[PDB]
Structures are given as C-alpha cells and as structure tokens.
Design a protein around this ligand. Structure first.
Ligand SMILES: c1ccc2ncncc2c1
Ligand SMILES: c1ccc2ncncc2c1
Lengths: 301, 296
C-alpha cells in the first residue's frame, strides 16, 4: 500500500521469538518436566520500540533479518497485531530466524537463558541500499554490526545532503551492548542512546559521569542520552547543559523487560513531534515508568 | 488389517542444541535450533513409517498454525491422520527441549495445555478392522482401560488368525497408570518408572513387575546404554546389549524409537529376542543422529 512520504519512523535491528517458561525448580539434566506457564513473545530491541511507537500513534516500520518459515510467521503476525509495517524486512536464504528459550525459576526469580544461535546474517549495507528512504522522517539504529551500519548511516547522511531542512531525515543510534565494535556509532546520529550497562562497563558510575565522559565522542550538534532506571534520565546537547528527569516509578514493579526500549521509543516519538529535549526526557521517563508496572506493552497507552 | 495404530500425544518440540547443559542463572548461546513433531505416539508413528509399516495416529489436536505444521509433517511421512480428535477448547501442547550435544542428553520442559485427552467415546467410533496392531501410550488410565476392553471384546469374536495385537506404554511414575500393566500382549515400562518403584536394573524391574501383567504377556524394559530386557510366560529373561553410536548427539525420542522398532519386529513374526535386538539396534542408530531421518 501507499505510504505518504516522510511519514514513518523506521527502526533497524533484531527481532526474536522468545519462549518463556515458569518452573517450580530448575530442571535436572536429562529430565522431563511440566512448566507452570509458558509464553511466546516477540522480542528484540528495535522490535520492542516498534511496538511502542505504534501504541503511541506513530506510523512505523521495522527493518531486520528473518528467514521464511514458521518462526517468521508467528513474528510477522505479532508485528502486525501491533500495527507495525514489515514491508522492509530483509528475508534471508541462510540461517535460523532468531528464537530463544527462558526458564524463570518461580522459587527464586532466577532466569536461565538459551540465547538464539548466530546463523542468520544481519542486515547489510547492500540490503539497506535497496531501500527507498523518502518514506521515512526518522531512522533509528540498534547498534549491532557496526561497520555495515556505518555505511547505512553515511548513506542517510548523503541523502540529507540533497534535501531541504524540512525534508531531512532525523537519525538516532543505540549502543546497548558493551562491545568495542559498537563505540564507533557514537559518531553518528542526531541522537545517541547509551545504556546504563554500557556506561558501567566503561566504568562510569552515574548518568552524569557517563554523559560528561562520552560526549566528546558524538558528532557536532548531537544529543547524548542515558537512562539509569530508578535514577531517572539525563541528556546532554551542544550547549553543554546537563538535563535531567527523575524516574516516575509505578505503585509496584511488575515487569521491567523492554522498559529501556520503551524509553528510547518515547524519547524518539516526543522529539519527532517537535518537543524539546527536556520534554522528551520527561515523557520518556513517564512512559517507561508506566510500562514497569504492567505486564507487556498493553496499557502503556 | 494392515495398519498399525498408535494412540497418544503429538507435541511441538522446540529444540535447542547446546555445547553443555546451562547452569542455573546463566545465559549461553546455542549452536542450532529446530522445530520437530514430538509426542511419544507421534514419534513411534514416524519410526514405523520409516520402517515401511503403514500406520496411523490417534490423539487430540486443536486447529491452528501449529496443528497445520504438525499435520503437514504426519503426511510427509505418510502417517494416517484420519483418526485424530480435533478440539475447540485448549491449544496444542509444546515444549522446549534442550539437547546437550556433548552427550546427546535431552531435557524437556513441557507446556501441557489443558486440551482434552482422547476418550473412550472417541475410541468406540473406530474401525478396528483395518488394524493389525494397536499401541496405547499411557495417559488417562481410567478411560484407556475402556479402550482396551473394547479391543479384547472385538478379539473374542475373531479367529487366532485375525486378532488385534496390543501394546501398552507406562512411561511416567504415576499411580493412575499402574493399572495399565494388566492389558496388552506387550507391555513397555520405562527405566524411570522402574526406578521410582525401587528397582535398580531391568532384570530386577522385570522379575519384580511380572505379577502385574495379564496372562501370557511380555514385559519389556529398556535401560539406555545398558540395552533392554524382556520377560514372557515361559519365565525366561531375555537380554539385548545396546547398540550405542560412537558419538551420542541426540537421545530425544530414542525410547519411542525403541518401542516402535520392537513392535514392527513383532508384528513381522520375529521372536521376542529378535525384536529386542532390533529395538536396540534402531534406537542406537537414532542416538547418533539429529532427528529421525537416517535411521534406516
Ligand atoms: C526503567 C527500568 C527500571 C525502572 N524501575 C523503576 N522506575 C523506572 C524504571 C525505568
Ligand atoms: C536410549 C536408548 C538407546 C541408547 N543407545 C545408546 N546410548 C543411549 C541410549 C539411550
């Protein structure tokens, strides 16, 4: 169908089928057991943010790798359940669609996780070349395979070079895995999200340390953003003023899975509506705080 | 009477192959992944099929994309699905199976949906004339005893030439089931049940459990890498060494493979000793492979 030009927010990243089982006790090897309950869930960073953008009322699209098959089928139907545009998926001829198994030990809250295999090629710069960008007002990249994503980021840069300033496509970038390859991505994006977990691995002990210690790495004009769960969130832009919002914790914490993807999408959404950085931090924190008191994404409204 | 009918579960097995069993609380990446049609009676049908025996499956299934994948697998294998009891309430069961590639150990977490079990009602409605053999996977004992009495009743009416041979599996250490020992020409009891009942080996499990079987039956008990044993009316213990592959890479379904192979051999007129060796021979071959293709 027809997508009006410059109307969609695109997220590029992982999607994965998560199978989650609740058990009485951790299973002894070679044993056969019944779980208390079991869920199949669409997972992944870029994937979660798409769900949030849709619920927020943004037209949105996902770009990631899948292989034809039943896993893909379940994931595509869930994507569509959430009003996500999947027309830019990069279908592969090799590899598994990512899927993962999690066992939550009911009597201690321990999570044991068999992560997906590593057989499916990530999205390539050549896959990205084939995409017509005019559809997109904002493009967001979950850092994964950096060297290739750098080329995608240069391609978008190139595109914007030729556009009026009101046909420019905004870009955001997430570095959430403490992996050296990823650190080059700081150089790209109007907006750069760094995770608490990454900040801590570089040895910063607070959002303020992280932002002040990393800002030197961002491109001129960029805003660097870092959320620290219960401690709220900071951003830092070209004017050197450290901004902050306190968390908006919920009555009780139910489910924090994907809370960070909820923050990222809300910040992106707010800014894409022309709100200020300060306004976006706050909204980001409000939405993510709500999410933490809910099971899944139903009701973050 | 040319078909063999197995009555039990079908389940989506969501399989992850790992280097080593995960420690509590850890997070390991797996080597590979697959979907596989599981369920004791379903695996046995796969194996029977591959052995060249026309066979049919009977069990509950809820309509869906899962079901669609299961059914499509059955047909690739030429397994007759005609007898399935489709439900409305409940979904198809599924499980996460971890297969330790360093020893073929398999660990199963099963999501047993509520989905209604096959019933005496459902069973009374089946044309027993097409069936040479009927194997029943212990599950809902109260109603399966009913299905058994049915088959015997039918049997009392036919010649020795035209009787329907019957086998029972008792796999879970579960009291309701322990009355199933009293039916069938051939009774399969798992190692796991054997141990949960105090018995330390297969021979001890057999001498200790023969009192429970109907008169003239054969009690079978396999024990993985120690092979399997059987005991019949004549009082003579039979043993077969295992046929272990040099590398064990996947034991998910080895037991169902052994059961189905014993049954094939028996329904082909071979001695119990021979059917025992064949059982171990095929099970063993299965354990050196991923899945079921390649066992024949
Ligand atoms: C993100 C993660 C955890 C949180 N806990 C409380 N309040 C807000 C949060 C945001
Ligand atoms: C079950 C059945 C047969 C086997 N053969 C070899 N090793 C392990 C086995 C487990």
């Amino acid at each position: 169908g027809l997508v009006p030009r410059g109307s969609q927010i695109l997220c590029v990243g992982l999607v994965v089928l998560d199978v989650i089982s609740l058990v009485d006790k951790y299973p002894k090897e070679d044993s056969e057991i019944r779980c208390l309950s079991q869920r199949w869930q669409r997972g992944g960073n870029a994937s979660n943010s798409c769900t949030v953008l849709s619920l927020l009322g943004a037209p949105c699209a996902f770009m990631g790798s899948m292989a034809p098959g039943h896993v893909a089928d379940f994931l595509v139907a869930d994507f569509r359940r959430r009003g996500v545009d999947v027309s830019q998926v990069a279908w592969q001829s090799k590899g598994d669609t990512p899927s993962s198994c999690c066992i939550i030990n009911n009597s201690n809250g321990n999570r044991t996780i068999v992560l997906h295999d590593t057989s499916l090629p990530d999205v390539s710069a050549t896959d990205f070349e084939k995409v017509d960008l005019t559809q997109f007002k904002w493009i967001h990249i979950e850092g994964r395979n950096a060297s290739e994503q750098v080329k995608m980021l240069q391609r978008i840069d190139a595109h914007n070079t030729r556009q009026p300033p009101e046909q420019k496509i905004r870009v955001s970038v997430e570095v959430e895995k403490p992996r050296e390859e990823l650190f080059q991505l700081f150089g790209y994006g109007d907006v750069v999200f760094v995770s608490k977990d990454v900040a801590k691995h570089l040895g910063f002990q607070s959002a303020e340390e992280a932002l002040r210690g990393l800002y030197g790495r961002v491109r001129k004009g960029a805003v660097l953003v870092c959320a620290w769960a219960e401690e709220g969130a900071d951003a830092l832009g070209p004017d050197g003023k450290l901004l902050h919002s306190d968390a908006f914790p919920p009555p009780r914490v139910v489910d924090t899975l994907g809370a960070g993807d909820t923050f990222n999408a809300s910040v992106i959404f707010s800014l894409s509506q022309g709100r200020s950085v300060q306004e976006a931090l706050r909204f980001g924190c409000q939405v993510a705080g709500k999410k933490c008191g809910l099971q899944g994404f139903d009701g973050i409204v």
